[PDB]
Amino acid sequence: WVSRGAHKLVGALEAFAIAVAGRRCLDAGASTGGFTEVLLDRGAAHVVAADVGYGQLAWSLRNDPRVVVLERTNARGLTPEAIGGRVDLVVADLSFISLATVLPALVGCASRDADIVPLVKPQFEVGKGQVGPGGVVHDPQLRARSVLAVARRAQELGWHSVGVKASPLPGPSGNVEYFLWLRTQTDRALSAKGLEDAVHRAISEGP
């Protein structure tokens, strides 16, 4: 792969059994292009790569006719108009911001039948004072609360939680991060107790 980030999204897509082939995708936080490369490899029709920070998209991805590169001030400004229409799959890997702040934008870019699969980073969700030594959320209970808070906000926007999967590679300084599968149209929405069980297994089962 172009980046080891590729392995994270493969892990998520395999765990949730989400197909990409033929679909229109948004990669929010595209940066090096790990996520974008995987989407293209799995048969995506079109990928919008929102460059929303430091890092350059690898030349080979930038020159692919299935890829549109957007260079926005941030992910929270994303709109259907800006990306050229709603998409079927949204993935997001964002640094030093809470997903609460961008979820309305991501939801607004998604079709009603889409999958939204953000990578939840407890170190960027918990309060200062709760982040442990070295900037690692060592406390599994706090990692669980982070994921639940993101799920709760998604649910307030009409997007239910269907599954949770620890990313197979840790993030900065060793933080464990977790993919959440969100859908607004599903026959498998987790209940409160169901999400608790799924989060508990994901946290106990690690990367």
mmCIF file of all heavy atoms in Angstrom, residues 8 14 23 31 35 43 66 71 81-82 86 107 125 135 141 144 149-150 154 160 162 165 170 176 185-186 190 193 195:
data_model
loop_
_atom_site.group_PDB
_atom_site.id
_atom_site.type_symbol
_atom_site.label_atom_id
_atom_site.label_comp_id
_atom_site.label_asym_id
_atom_site.label_seq_id
_atom_site.Cartn_x
_atom_site.Cartn_y
_atom_site.Cartn_z
ATOM 1 N N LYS A 8 -5.858 -0.192 8.184
ATOM 2 C CA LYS A 8 -6.922 0.118 9.126
ATOM 3 C C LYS A 8 -8.284 -0.028 8.454
ATOM 4 O O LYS A 8 -9.174 -0.665 8.987
ATOM 5 C CB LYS A 8 -6.775 1.530 9.676
ATOM 6 C CG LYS A 8 -5.431 1.763 10.380
ATOM 7 C CD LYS A 8 -5.374 3.101 11.099
ATOM 8 C CE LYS A 8 -4.395 4.082 10.537
ATOM 9 N NZ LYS A 8 -3.532 4.697 11.588
ATOM 10 N N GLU A 14 -13.760 -5.276 6.221
ATOM 11 C CA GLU A 14 -13.867 -6.733 6.398
ATOM 12 C C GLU A 14 -14.694 -7.124 7.602
ATOM 13 O O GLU A 14 -15.554 -8.010 7.520
ATOM 14 C CB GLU A 14 -12.473 -7.385 6.481
ATOM 15 C CG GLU A 14 -11.746 -7.354 5.150
ATOM 16 C CD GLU A 14 -12.363 -8.271 4.087
ATOM 17 O OE1 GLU A 14 -12.655 -9.450 4.379
ATOM 18 O OE2 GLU A 14 -12.560 -7.812 2.933
ATOM 19 N N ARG A 23 -19.401 2.169 -5.954
ATOM 20 C CA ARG A 23 -19.977 3.208 -5.086
ATOM 21 C C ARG A 23 -19.205 4.527 -5.164
ATOM 22 O O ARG A 23 -18.046 4.566 -5.545
ATOM 23 C CB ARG A 23 -20.043 2.735 -3.643
ATOM 24 C CG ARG A 23 -20.905 1.509 -3.476
ATOM 25 C CD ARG A 23 -20.872 1.009 -2.059
ATOM 26 N NE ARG A 23 -21.965 1.533 -1.238
ATOM 27 C CZ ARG A 23 -21.990 1.512 0.100
ATOM 28 N NH1 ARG A 23 -20.982 1.014 0.827
ATOM 29 N NH2 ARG A 23 -23.046 2.000 0.724
ATOM 30 N N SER A 31 -5.384 13.122 3.227
ATOM 31 C CA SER A 31 -3.931 13.222 3.525
ATOM 32 C C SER A 31 -3.023 12.375 2.605
ATOM 33 O O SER A 31 -2.878 12.746 1.447
ATOM 34 C CB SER A 31 -3.636 13.012 5.023
ATOM 35 O OG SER A 31 -3.616 11.645 5.407
ATOM 36 N N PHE A 35 -6.636 5.519 2.843
ATOM 37 C CA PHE A 35 -8.041 5.168 2.759
ATOM 38 C C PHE A 35 -8.473 5.212 1.307
ATOM 39 O O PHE A 35 -9.174 4.304 0.834
ATOM 40 C CB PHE A 35 -8.909 6.072 3.653
ATOM 41 C CG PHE A 35 -8.892 5.700 5.119
ATOM 42 C CD1 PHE A 35 -7.828 4.998 5.703
ATOM 43 C CD2 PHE A 35 -9.946 6.077 5.924
ATOM 44 C CE1 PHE A 35 -7.843 4.678 7.053
ATOM 45 C CE2 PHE A 35 -9.969 5.749 7.260
ATOM 46 C CZ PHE A 35 -8.912 5.052 7.829
ATOM 47 N N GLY A 43 -12.869 -1.242 -5.829
ATOM 48 C CA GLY A 43 -13.746 -1.028 -6.977
ATOM 49 C C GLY A 43 -14.625 0.208 -6.888
ATOM 50 O O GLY A 43 -15.634 0.281 -7.577
ATOM 51 N N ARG A 66 -10.748 8.450 -11.360
ATOM 52 C CA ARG A 66 -11.776 8.196 -10.345
ATOM 53 C C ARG A 66 -11.648 9.072 -9.090
ATOM 54 O O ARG A 66 -12.550 9.071 -8.270
ATOM 55 C CB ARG A 66 -11.775 6.730 -9.960
ATOM 56 C CG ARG A 66 -12.200 5.798 -11.107
ATOM 57 C CD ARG A 66 -12.062 4.355 -10.645
ATOM 58 N NE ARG A 66 -10.645 4.052 -10.421
ATOM 59 C CZ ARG A 66 -10.155 3.082 -9.651
ATOM 60 N NH1 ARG A 66 -10.949 2.263 -8.958
ATOM 61 N NH2 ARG A 66 -8.832 2.953 -9.551
ATOM 62 N N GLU A 71 -9.406 20.651 -1.563
ATOM 63 C CA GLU A 71 -8.474 21.228 -0.617
ATOM 64 C C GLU A 71 -9.236 22.288 0.150
ATOM 65 O O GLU A 71 -9.312 23.429 -0.270
ATOM 66 C CB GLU A 71 -7.270 21.771 -1.366
ATOM 67 C CG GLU A 71 -6.550 20.663 -2.131
ATOM 68 C CD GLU A 71 -5.395 21.144 -2.975
ATOM 69 O OE1 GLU A 71 -5.153 22.372 -3.048
ATOM 70 O OE2 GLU A 71 -4.729 20.271 -3.575
ATOM 71 N N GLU A 81 -22.826 20.130 -2.231
ATOM 72 C CA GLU A 81 -22.536 21.044 -3.321
ATOM 73 C C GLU A 81 -21.032 21.076 -3.573
ATOM 74 O O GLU A 81 -20.589 20.927 -4.705
ATOM 75 C CB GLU A 81 -23.076 22.450 -3.011
ATOM 76 C CG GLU A 81 -24.606 22.560 -2.986
ATOM 77 C CD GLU A 81 -25.289 21.811 -1.831
ATOM 78 O OE1 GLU A 81 -24.682 21.638 -0.739
ATOM 79 O OE2 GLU A 81 -26.449 21.376 -2.017
ATOM 80 N N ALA A 82 -20.256 21.225 -2.507
ATOM 81 C CA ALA A 82 -18.798 21.271 -2.614
ATOM 82 C C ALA A 82 -18.173 19.967 -3.153
ATOM 83 O O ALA A 82 -17.211 20.005 -3.913
ATOM 84 C CB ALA A 82 -18.194 21.618 -1.265
ATOM 85 N N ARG A 86 -24.235 13.900 -3.062
ATOM 86 C CA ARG A 86 -24.165 13.001 -1.928
ATOM 87 C C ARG A 86 -23.503 11.679 -2.307
ATOM 88 O O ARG A 86 -23.509 11.299 -3.466
ATOM 89 C CB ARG A 86 -25.550 12.742 -1.369
ATOM 90 C CG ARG A 86 -26.135 13.935 -0.665
ATOM 91 C CD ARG A 86 -27.611 13.712 -0.420
ATOM 92 N NE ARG A 86 -28.171 14.833 0.324
ATOM 93 C CZ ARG A 86 -28.048 15.018 1.640
ATOM 94 N NH1 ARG A 86 -27.378 14.155 2.409
ATOM 95 N NH2 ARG A 86 -28.605 16.094 2.199
ATOM 96 N N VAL A 107 -22.789 13.706 7.809
ATOM 97 C CA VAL A 107 -24.181 13.255 7.592
ATOM 98 C C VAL A 107 -24.836 13.957 6.416
ATOM 99 O O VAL A 107 -25.540 13.323 5.639
ATOM 100 C CB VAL A 107 -24.996 13.410 8.900
ATOM 101 C CG1 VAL A 107 -26.498 13.482 8.694
ATOM 102 C CG2 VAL A 107 -24.626 12.286 9.825
ATOM 103 N N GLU A 125 -11.429 12.961 21.811
ATOM 104 C CA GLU A 125 -12.826 13.036 22.269
ATOM 105 C C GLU A 125 -12.944 13.340 23.760
ATOM 106 O O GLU A 125 -13.896 13.976 24.176
ATOM 107 C CB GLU A 125 -13.549 11.712 22.020
ATOM 108 C CG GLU A 125 -13.714 11.302 20.559
ATOM 109 C CD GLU A 125 -14.470 12.315 19.708
ATOM 110 O OE1 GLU A 125 -15.321 13.058 20.260
ATOM 111 O OE2 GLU A 125 -14.218 12.376 18.473
ATOM 112 N N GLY A 135 -0.432 11.381 26.806
ATOM 113 C CA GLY A 135 -1.519 11.588 25.851
ATOM 114 C C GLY A 135 -2.202 10.305 25.382
ATOM 115 O O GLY A 135 -2.796 10.272 24.311
ATOM 116 N N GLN A 141 -12.474 2.170 30.120
ATOM 117 C CA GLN A 141 -13.805 2.743 30.374
ATOM 118 C C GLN A 141 -13.955 4.088 29.685
ATOM 119 O O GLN A 141 -14.974 4.393 29.113
ATOM 120 C CB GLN A 141 -14.042 2.931 31.880
ATOM 121 C CG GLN A 141 -13.849 1.672 32.690
ATOM 122 C CD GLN A 141 -14.878 0.661 32.315
ATOM 123 O OE1 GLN A 141 -16.064 0.846 32.616
ATOM 124 N NE2 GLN A 141 -14.456 -0.398 31.622
ATOM 125 N N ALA A 144 -14.386 3.571 25.983
ATOM 126 C CA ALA A 144 -15.748 3.164 25.729
ATOM 127 C C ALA A 144 -16.686 4.371 25.749
ATOM 128 O O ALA A 144 -17.510 4.495 24.858
ATOM 129 C CB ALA A 144 -16.192 2.099 26.701
ATOM 130 N N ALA A 149 -20.233 8.356 23.176
ATOM 131 C CA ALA A 149 -20.587 9.764 22.971
ATOM 132 C C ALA A 149 -20.711 10.100 21.478
ATOM 133 O O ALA A 149 -21.606 10.855 21.045
ATOM 134 C CB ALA A 149 -19.590 10.684 23.676
ATOM 135 N N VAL A 150 -19.816 9.546 20.675
ATOM 136 C CA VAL A 150 -19.922 9.717 19.261
ATOM 137 C C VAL A 150 -21.203 9.038 18.719
ATOM 138 O O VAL A 150 -21.950 9.635 17.970
ATOM 139 C CB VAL A 150 -18.626 9.248 18.554
ATOM 140 C CG1 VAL A 150 -18.824 9.235 17.051
ATOM 141 C CG2 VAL A 150 -17.479 10.158 18.970
ATOM 142 N N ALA A 154 -24.390 10.843 16.795
ATOM 143 C CA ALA A 154 -24.827 10.337 15.488
ATOM 144 C C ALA A 154 -26.313 9.997 15.523
ATOM 145 O O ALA A 154 -27.077 10.319 14.596
ATOM 146 C CB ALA A 154 -24.016 9.118 15.092
ATOM 147 N N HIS A 160 -27.919 5.528 13.262
ATOM 148 C CA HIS A 160 -27.829 4.519 14.318
ATOM 149 C C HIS A 160 -26.503 3.784 14.222
ATOM 150 O O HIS A 160 -25.901 3.704 13.145
ATOM 151 C CB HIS A 160 -28.965 3.507 14.158
ATOM 152 C CG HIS A 160 -30.298 4.149 14.151
ATOM 153 N ND1 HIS A 160 -30.785 4.820 15.249
ATOM 154 C CD2 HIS A 160 -31.200 4.332 13.159
ATOM 155 C CE1 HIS A 160 -31.948 5.373 14.940
ATOM 156 N NE2 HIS A 160 -32.221 5.091 13.680
ATOM 157 N N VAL A 162 -24.450 0.312 14.135
ATOM 158 C CA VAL A 162 -24.612 -1.071 13.695
ATOM 159 C C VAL A 162 -23.471 -1.986 14.160
ATOM 160 O O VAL A 162 -23.666 -3.197 14.335
ATOM 161 C CB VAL A 162 -24.718 -1.112 12.145
ATOM 162 C CG1 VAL A 162 -25.031 -2.527 11.648
ATOM 163 C CG2 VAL A 162 -25.799 -0.170 11.688
ATOM 164 N N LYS A 165 -15.545 -1.781 15.802
ATOM 165 C CA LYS A 165 -14.354 -2.577 15.531
ATOM 166 C C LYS A 165 -13.106 -1.762 15.901
ATOM 167 O O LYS A 165 -12.897 -0.676 15.339
ATOM 168 C CB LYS A 165 -14.294 -2.894 14.025
ATOM 169 C CG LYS A 165 -13.076 -3.644 13.521
ATOM 170 C CD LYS A 165 -13.005 -5.051 14.061
ATOM 171 C CE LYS A 165 -11.691 -5.651 13.559
ATOM 172 N NZ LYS A 165 -11.440 -6.911 14.271
ATOM 173 N N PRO A 170 -2.566 0.899 16.227
ATOM 174 C CA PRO A 170 -2.828 2.048 17.095
ATOM 175 C C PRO A 170 -2.480 3.375 16.405
ATOM 176 O O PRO A 170 -1.791 3.392 15.375
ATOM 177 C CB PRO A 170 -1.935 1.806 18.305
ATOM 178 C CG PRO A 170 -0.865 0.919 17.823
ATOM 179 C CD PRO A 170 -1.450 0.078 16.715
ATOM 180 N N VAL A 176 -5.355 3.324 21.185
ATOM 181 C CA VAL A 176 -6.249 2.425 20.463
ATOM 182 C C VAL A 176 -7.431 3.268 19.956
ATOM 183 O O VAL A 176 -7.942 4.124 20.672
ATOM 184 C CB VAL A 176 -6.762 1.284 21.370
ATOM 185 C CG1 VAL A 176 -7.663 0.319 20.553
ATOM 186 C CG2 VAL A 176 -5.576 0.565 21.978
ATOM 187 N N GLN A 185 -30.604 3.802 7.549
ATOM 188 C CA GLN A 185 -31.542 2.770 7.044
ATOM 189 C C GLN A 185 -30.913 1.419 7.308
ATOM 190 O O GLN A 185 -29.979 0.999 6.606
ATOM 191 C CB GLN A 185 -31.840 2.954 5.557
ATOM 192 C CG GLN A 185 -32.647 4.233 5.344
ATOM 193 C CD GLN A 185 -33.040 4.549 3.911
ATOM 194 O OE1 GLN A 185 -33.949 5.341 3.699
ATOM 195 N NE2 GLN A 185 -32.342 3.978 2.930
ATOM 196 N N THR A 186 -31.439 0.721 8.317
ATOM 197 C CA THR A 186 -30.909 -0.586 8.715
ATOM 198 C C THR A 186 -31.925 -1.396 9.501
ATOM 199 O O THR A 186 -32.796 -0.830 10.194
ATOM 200 C CB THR A 186 -29.607 -0.441 9.539
ATOM 201 O OG1 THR A 186 -29.136 -1.733 9.940
ATOM 202 C CG2 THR A 186 -29.803 0.413 10.785
ATOM 203 N N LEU A 190 -28.211 -1.163 16.673
ATOM 204 C CA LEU A 190 -27.960 -1.611 18.027
ATOM 205 C C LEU A 190 -28.856 -0.867 19.008
ATOM 206 O O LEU A 190 -29.007 0.359 18.907
ATOM 207 C CB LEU A 190 -26.493 -1.426 18.413
ATOM 208 C CG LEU A 190 -25.536 -2.348 17.648
ATOM 209 C CD1 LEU A 190 -24.154 -1.815 17.621
ATOM 210 C CD2 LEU A 190 -25.567 -3.754 18.238
ATOM 211 N N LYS A 193 -28.340 -1.504 25.025
ATOM 212 C CA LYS A 193 -27.624 -2.604 25.651
ATOM 213 C C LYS A 193 -26.787 -3.355 24.629
ATOM 214 O O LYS A 193 -25.689 -3.900 24.940
ATOM 215 C CB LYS A 193 -28.598 -3.552 26.338
ATOM 216 C CG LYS A 193 -29.441 -2.881 27.405
ATOM 217 C CD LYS A 193 -28.607 -2.298 28.523
ATOM 218 C CE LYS A 193 -28.111 -3.368 29.484
ATOM 219 N NZ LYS A 193 -27.835 -2.714 30.798
ATOM 220 N N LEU A 195 -25.342 -1.958 21.916
ATOM 221 C CA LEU A 195 -24.142 -1.182 21.713
ATOM 222 C C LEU A 195 -23.163 -1.322 22.862
ATOM 223 O O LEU A 195 -21.978 -1.380 22.659
ATOM 224 C CB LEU A 195 -24.465 0.299 21.450
ATOM 225 C CG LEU A 195 -23.277 1.212 21.155
ATOM 226 C CD1 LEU A 195 -22.600 0.803 19.854
ATOM 227 C CD2 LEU A 195 -23.831 2.609 21.018
#
